[PDB]
Amino acid sequence: IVLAASGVEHEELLSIAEPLLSDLPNVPRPEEPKSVYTGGDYRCHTESGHI
Amino acid sequence: IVLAASGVEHEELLSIAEPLLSDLPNVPRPEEPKSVYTGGDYRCHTESGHI
């Protein structure tokens, strides 16, 4: 998680977000899944109601 | 057009069906269309309410 402000001086948002967002428990980020690039082909002629 | 009967004497059937079909005009038969075999592939998933 990450906040991001575009018009807020840092002290305001920090003093506001510390009391609320400091309670989330600590857990180590699981690894990312795996994707590979392969060839392929896909095909679907439009509906006969459009031909 | 061809008439095919299973349990009928030929002469009676011919006598009945001669006055009705003999009047059709004669015309050369059009040449049969053609199709050449071509290996291909087809895929289409079922409606996704039944997976």
Automatic annotation (TrEMBL), chains A, B:
Highest taxon of source: Eukaryota
Coiled-coil region list: none
Residues annotated as signal peptide: none
Subcellular location as annotated: Mitochondrion inner membrane
Functional summary from the UniProt entry: Substrate recognition and binding subunit of the essential mitochondrial processing protease (MPP), which cleaves the mitochondrial sequence off newly imported precursors proteins.
Protein family per UniProt: Belongs to the peptidase M16 family.
Protein name (record): Complex III subunit II
Stretch of the intact protein here: 260 to 310 of 515
